[PDB]
Amino acid sequence: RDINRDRLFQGSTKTHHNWFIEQALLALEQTNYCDFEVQFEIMHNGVHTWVGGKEPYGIGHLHYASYDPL
Amino acid sequence: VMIRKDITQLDKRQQLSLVKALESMKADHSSDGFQAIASFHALPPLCPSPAASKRFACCVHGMATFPQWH
């Protein structure tokens, strides 16, 4: 895992508001399950990319990601 | 159900309130005020009476009652 972007820890100064939180909260807002899932799933994707980074065998790749314990 | 949580867990907003509240409490002129509240535990000693020649500190320390008092 090449968490090239350590930047993840760069949250907001207020600290509550975070990108994840903003994204997640919005997802929570929807009543419809389907609508909820689209937002929900995308938020999910971010972690995969952030950890995997550039590395060929990692979280970032669909193929490889299951291998990592994260 | 006011909730007491680990200090670490606390939110910035949660923290925000405590910091402001205590600071305001510090200012509080009232008997309810912080300086006054502090006197409950120890000096100035209030126990025998608020105005009594010999005063003892309010510690039901070394007693069964101790956890209740605190």
Ligand code: CUO
């Ligand atoms: O102070 Cu009297 O007990 Cu912790």
